[PDB]
Amino acid sequence: VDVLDPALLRSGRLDRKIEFPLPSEDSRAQILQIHSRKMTTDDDINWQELARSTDEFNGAQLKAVTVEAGMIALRNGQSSVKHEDFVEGISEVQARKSKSVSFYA
Amino acid sequence: QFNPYGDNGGTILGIAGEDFAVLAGDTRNITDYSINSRYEPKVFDCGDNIVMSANGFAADGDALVKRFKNSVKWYHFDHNDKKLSINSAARNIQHLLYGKRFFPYYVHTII
């Protein structure tokens, strides 16, 4: 909206400006579930656990996590998704590597 | 003034056998012309098959026993559960006794 033209907002030429924030914790829990429905769905998945972990994530970013969870699961050949797969789907959509052993791992 | 020590009598005795070894002592504790107590263990097991008796002046002796007791636990924690030898113990106690030297313990110890 910084790029947006100032004279369009100026005065009561256009009224009511509505800002959509980042999803809340509440909103994140709902967004993963709905997408999951389309693939295989298991109730060992605790969706609250996932919503806490993600920080600064959009709904776009979460659709990719749902799809990714499906990519890792197919790769292994497990025809039924786990919660484990899902947790490994946060760190391959993000550019980080959590797959690298350390000095305590 | 103050007297930082006094005395508390008693007799302790160590006899070393050749596969059993005995550390004995009286349970009478006295001060001056009172018998304070009939019964009172002064020979204390410390674990790892080590008995310790520290007899003289009660203040000095009970405190030293207690301080050694703490060490045996510290030894298992930092040395991953290594038993203490009697001779190794004998050396630990030298460093406990000399560790105050300008207000020293004033009990004759036998382990």
């Binding site: 980080r96 590597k97 959590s98 350390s102 000095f103 305590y104 | 930092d78 040395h79 991953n80 290594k82 038993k83 203490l84 030898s85 001779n87 190794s88 050396r91 630990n92 460093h95």
Partner: protein, 245 residues
């Protein structure tokens, strides 16, 4: 990236970057191999001669810590000077306090406690080292109630017991061979020649006694640093072994 300059100080993964970077100092260094056997632990090292004016056997990469605890080293010898001194003191005070030969496991922990000081101030042990150390050790010895052990001290303050462990540049390659070459039934002459077989492959120059320096922990001999005459004899026997094959 942008989370790495400090030592306090994280890190979206959760790791201390400064600590992980010191791992990479160890690969800069010259290859050192150790192999525990049930007859003793052999600590061989590589030395590298920048000029054939650097006097090989006046550079020390194996050092004596006590009469029963030894170390080999790799990485910065600036950091190894403080690192080693600490441990030499640990063994000498342990003999003073308890008369008993320091246990290898506890001797490692003393090194690694000192490794832990990173910060410039903490609760508990009061931090007074301004950075992690830049040196690993292989720690070898023999205690009486657990026999021969070979440990690797890390500059990150963690200790892994090993049957065999390599550090230095040639760490990856040695480690690959030793996966195919350790046994329960190996012997100390066998160990000695095992270290050299692995060593020639991971040295950039060639195998000479000038550029090698093996040593043993045997209960009988105690800690014995060898000579080059000794080391040369072993080299000549490696070459014989590989000839037949």
């Amino acid at each position: 990236s942008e989370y790495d300059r400090g030592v306090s100080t994280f890190s979206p993964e959760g790791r201390l970057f400064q600590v992980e970077y010191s791992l990479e100092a160890i690969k800069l260094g010259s290859t050192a191999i150790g192999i525990a056997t049930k007859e003793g632990v052999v600590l061989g090292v590589e030395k590298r001669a920048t000029s054939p004016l650097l006097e090989s056997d006046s550079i020390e990469k194996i050092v004596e810590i006590d009469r029963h605890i030894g170390c080999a080293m790799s990485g910065l010898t600036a950091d190894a000077r403080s690192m080693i001194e600490h441990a030499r003191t640990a063994a000498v005070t342990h003999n003073l306090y308890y008369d008993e030969d320091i246990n290898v496991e506890s001797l490692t922990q003393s090194v690694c406690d000192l490794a832990l000081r990173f910060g410039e101030g903490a609760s508990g042990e009061e931090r007074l080292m301004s950075r992690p150390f830049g040196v690993a050790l292989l720690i070898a010895g023999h205690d009486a109630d657990d026999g021969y052990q070979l440990f690797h001290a890390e500059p990150s303050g963690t200790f892994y017991r090993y049957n065999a462990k390599a550090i230095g540049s040639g760490s990856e390659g040695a480690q690959a061979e030793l996966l195919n070459e350790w046994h329960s039934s190996l012997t100390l002459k066998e160990a000695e020649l095992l270290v050299l077989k692995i060593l020639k492959q991971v040295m950039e120059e060639k195998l000479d006694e000038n550029n090698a320096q093996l040593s043993c922990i045997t209960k009988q001999d105690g800690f014995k640093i060898y000579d080059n005459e000794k080391t040369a004899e072993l080299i000549k026997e490696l070459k014989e072994k590989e000839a037949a094959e």
